[PDB]
Amino acid sequence: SWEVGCGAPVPLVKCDENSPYRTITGDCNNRRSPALGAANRALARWLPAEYEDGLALPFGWTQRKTRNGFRVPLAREVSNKIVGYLDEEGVLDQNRSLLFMQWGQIVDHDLDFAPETELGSNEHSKTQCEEYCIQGDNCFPIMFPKNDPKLKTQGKCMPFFRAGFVCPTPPYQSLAREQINAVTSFLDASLVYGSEPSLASRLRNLSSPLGLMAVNQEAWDHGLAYLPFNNKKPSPCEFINTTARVPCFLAGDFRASEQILLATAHTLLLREHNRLARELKKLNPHWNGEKLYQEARKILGAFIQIITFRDYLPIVLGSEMQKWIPPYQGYNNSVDPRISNVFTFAFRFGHMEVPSTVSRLDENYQPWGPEAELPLHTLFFNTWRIIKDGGIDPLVRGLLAKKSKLMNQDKMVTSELRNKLFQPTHKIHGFDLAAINLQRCRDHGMPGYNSWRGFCGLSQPKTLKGLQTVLKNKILAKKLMDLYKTPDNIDIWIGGNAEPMVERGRVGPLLACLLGRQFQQIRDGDRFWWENPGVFTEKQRDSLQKVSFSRLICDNTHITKVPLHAFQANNYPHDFVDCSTVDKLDLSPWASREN
Ligand code: HEM
Ligand SMILES: *[C@@H]1O[C@H](CO)[C@@H](O[C@@H]2O[C@H](CO)[C@@H](O[C@H]3O[C@H](CO)[C@@H](O)[C@H](O)[C@@H]3O)[C@H](O)[C@H]2NC(C)=O)[C@H](O)[C@H]1NC(C)=O
Ligand SMILES: *[C@@H]1O[C@H](CO)[C@@H](O[C@@H]2O[C@H](CO)[C@@H](O[C@H]3O[C@H](CO)[C@@H](O)[C@H](O)[C@@H]3O)[C@H](O)[C@H]2NC(C)=O)[C@H](O)[C@H]1NC(C)=O
Ligand SMILES: *[C@@H]1O[C@H](CO)[C@@H](O[C@@H]2O[C@H](CO)[C@@H](O)[C@H](O)[C@H]2NC(C)=O)[C@H](O)[C@H]1NC(C)=O
Ligand SMILES: *[C@@H]1O[C@H](CO)[C@@H](O[C@@H]2O[C@H](CO)[C@@H](O)[C@H](O)[C@H]2NC(C)=O)[C@H](O)[C@H]1NC(C)=O
Numbered sequence: 001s002w003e004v005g006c007g008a009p010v011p012l013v014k015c016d017e018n019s020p021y022r023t024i025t026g027d028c029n030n031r032r033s034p035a036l037g038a039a040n041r042a043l044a045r046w047l048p049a050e051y052e053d054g055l056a057l058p059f060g061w062t063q064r065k066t067r068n069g070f071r072v073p074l075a076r077e078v079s080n081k082i083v084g085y086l087d088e089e090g091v092l093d094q095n096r097s098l099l100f101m102q103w104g105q106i107v108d109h110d111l112d113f114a115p116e117t118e119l120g121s122n123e124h125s126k127t128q129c130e131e132y133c134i135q136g137d138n139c140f141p142i143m144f145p146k147n148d149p150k151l152k153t154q155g156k157c158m159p160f161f162r163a164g165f166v167c168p169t170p171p172y173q174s175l176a177r178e179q180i181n182a183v184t185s186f187l188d189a190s191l192v193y194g195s196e197p198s199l200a201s202r203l204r205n206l207s208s209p210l211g212l213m214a215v216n217q218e219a220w221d222h223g224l225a226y227l228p229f230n231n232k233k234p235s236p237c238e239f240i241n242t243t244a245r246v247p248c249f250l251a252g253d254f255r256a257s258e259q260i261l262l263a264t265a266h267t268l269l270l271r272e273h274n275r276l277a278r279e280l281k282k283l284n285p286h287w288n289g290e291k292l293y294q295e296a297r298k299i300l301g302a303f304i305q306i307i308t309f310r311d312y313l314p315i316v317l318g319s320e321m322q323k324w325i326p327p328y329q330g331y332n333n334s335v336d337p338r339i340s341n342v343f344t345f346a347f348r349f350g351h352m353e354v355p356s357t358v359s360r361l362d363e364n365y366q367p368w369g370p371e372a373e374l375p376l377h378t379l380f381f382n383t384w385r386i387i388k389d390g391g392i393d394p395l396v397r398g399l400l401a402k403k404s405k406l407m408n409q410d411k412m413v414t415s416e417l418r419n420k421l422f423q424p425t426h427k428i429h430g431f432d433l434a435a436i437n438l439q440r441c442r443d444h445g446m447p448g449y450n451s452w453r454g455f456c457g458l459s460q461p462k463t464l465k466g467l468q469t470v471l472k473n474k475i476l477a478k479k480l481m482d483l484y485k486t487p488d489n490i491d492i493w494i495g496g497n498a499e500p501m502v503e504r505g506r507v508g509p510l511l512a513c514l515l516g517r518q519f520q521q522i523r524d525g526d527r528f529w530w531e532n533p534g535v536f537t538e539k540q541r542d543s544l545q546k547v548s549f550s551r552l553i554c555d556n557t558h559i560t561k562v563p564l565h566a567f568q569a570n571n572y573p574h575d576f577v578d579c580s581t582v583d584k585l586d587l588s589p590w591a592s593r594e595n
């Protein structure tokens with residue numbers, strides 16, 4: 001047997017089934033199988049899980065059981081010998097703006113979220129894990145190798161908690177452990193509106209019947225809206241500066257404040273929903289609040305889908321784009337729209353695209369003040385630099401005029417993320433995102449590198465010289481061999497990111513395959529995909545193809561000069577045009593005449 005039975009904690013509701021609007025949870029998209037792609041369900045498995053005991057224990061848990069005959073190397077040791085570098089000179093992508101990196105984190109947050117297990121509010125396990133590095137239950141510490149400088153200064157390990165799973169979150173036992181995806185699988189702007197009934201309602205402004213989203217009432221950006229502050233204390237955003245005491249923002253996704261440019265992107269989208277809702281009220285005075293909200297919501301989701309598939313994916317996938325993603329042929333109800341477990345690691349290629357600094361530029365795109373350029377690590381869960389230091393326009397300009405970091409085999413992840421990451425639950429700027437990614441691969445039961453190469457129909461190197469040829473790098477292959485002792489054991493996150501990039505793309509062959517297949521499925525398996533006949537009218541679709549991120553900036557900021565193609569590297573002032581030259585979204589096709 002299969003067992004489609006286990007479904008426990010899910011947010012089930014009844015399907016209206018003629019509603020022209022998506023549900024908040026993702027349910028009812030697929031008519032024959034209503035829960036397909038919904039939030040709070042297990043991530044799909046394209047291949048069986050690989051755990052140390054076949055059921056739930058990650059490889060590396062029992063420093064006594066090997067993987068294919070060899071001990072798996074420490075997550076942090078692989079990070080130190082392969083992922084790190086010191087020199088930031090020459091590391092920038094010459095043909096990708098900072099926005100290229102930032103849009104990827106937005107798309108990713110719309111699609112997947114596998115939360116850490118809790119079982120702890122007034123818990124000492126969150127201390128037994130952090131304080132003593134005792135592995136057990138959901139605590140699976142990242143231990144430091146001999147000679148790691150963090151040993152001298154931080155402790156014996158980095159605390160790490162296992163990801164939540166379906167059927168309980170208590171102990172449990174029976175079938176293999178499947179992690180949860182707490183957001184909707186469809187590209188539907190759930191990062192703005194929420195994936196839950198609760199949260200979505202709370203984000204809305206129901207005092208007025210205008211279909212607007214709630215906005216901050218304590219601060220304004222030159223009369224432009226800020227997201228509302230989050231209710232919860234202790235707040236990570238005020239701990240980083242107890243003097244400013246500025247809390248984190250409240251948005252449709254819980255990671256909105258992880259870094260300043262992510263919060264900036266979230267603010268733009270919140271502003272766009274409100275802009276849309278009042279423009280729709282101008283054209284249709286009779287529409288009620290709910291209708292304004294849903295209609296504004298539907299348009300914004302179409303915008304994310306368009307920017308993502310027309311502008312972003314072609315420059316990630318490059319020449320592999322047509323290979324995995326065919327031109328759209330219509331909705332396919334037999335296609336599985338669920339985000340796969342391996343995708344959540346494949347999409348983490350963006351971590352190698354994050355540069356070490358962030359800039360605030362003034363109106364002539366010149367350095368904004370004395371401390372214009374800031375190290376990235378000072379900006380994790382930092383909301384005060386926005387509210388107290390200039391608003392979002394200076395940050396938006398930097399997104400347009402600065403570059404992303406280029407993935408480089410000798411320089412993979414910046415130290416701002418590799419040694420100085422700040423985690424919401426803890427107090428130090430001392431975590432390692434690369435080590436966490438590797439440890440999480442094991443936590444999630446990921447098959448190894450060659451298993452995924454096979455899945456994609458690519459060769460599977462078994463020797464040093466095999467890897468060399470595939471990676472087209474002798475030194476990298478050798479370092480990987482000395483740590484893993486067999487390409488079969490290489491964790492998918494580093495194996496996939498170590499491959500040279502495809503022509504015109506920014507990921508290698510393995511990743512192009514994993515990414516490409518996933519994106520083909522959420523497009524083809526989405527009943528509300530924007531091009532699906534009947535979702536929008538021919539005239540509405542005609543108006544929607546003229547959207548651009550440039551216009552979004554023009555309409556929701558006080559920036560007047562923007563580039564036409566925001567994802568490629570743009571130099572000021574030559575590549576910048578005046579906002580009034582940029583195509584506007586024409587909303588007259590939405591006008592609704594009575595008689
Ligand atoms: C800080 C972090 C970023 C920027 C400075 C950053 C950036 C990205 C980009 C550009 C991505 C894709 C193009 C991307 C993907 C995914 N991330 Fe990552 N990210 C930062 C920090 C984190 C942290 C912390 C996590 C959680 C790690 C854990 O396993 O505990 C993280 C995750 C992910 C993730 C998987 C999300 C999920 O499904 O649970 C991506 C797909 N990022 N980030
Ligand atoms: C830096 O990156 C740029 C963006 O990837 C790249 O320019 C792009 O090259 C494509 C090639 O396909 C050109 O595209 C378009 O071709 C027809 C127009 O005849 C259109 O119908 C299609 O939509 C297709 O996209 C563009 O000229 C260009 N795309 C954009 C958006 O600018 C640069 O060439 C790169 N620069 C270098 C030196 O590598
Ligand atoms: C914690 O947040 C504080 C802001 O809420 C921040 O202090 C602010 O930063 C600088 C001083 O370093 C000041 O900015 C400018 O103010 C006047 C003009 O009004 C100039 O003459 C100064 O020279 C300075 O350039 C702010 O006034 C200051 N605000 C206050 C109330 O002190 C702290 O730097 C943050 N601390 C940390 C550790 O991040
Ligand atoms: C919900 O919407 C109302 C109405 O648009 C907002 O109230 C307006 O707020 C602006 C700015 O504070 C003021 O100039 C007006 O006094 C208000 N206009 C009206 C007609 O009441 C209200 O702030 C919104 N609430 C939230 C939490 O976002
Ligand atoms: C819609 O997608 C489904 C599921 O991916 C496809 O179904 C395939 O049907 C062909 C028969 O033409 C078989 O070769 C396969 O066994 C199915 N493939 C898989 C991987 O399940 C199909 O391509 C699409 N269906 C239509 C009618 O367009």
Ligand SMILES: [Ca+2]
Nearest residue numbers: 110184186190
């Ligand atoms: Ca979603």
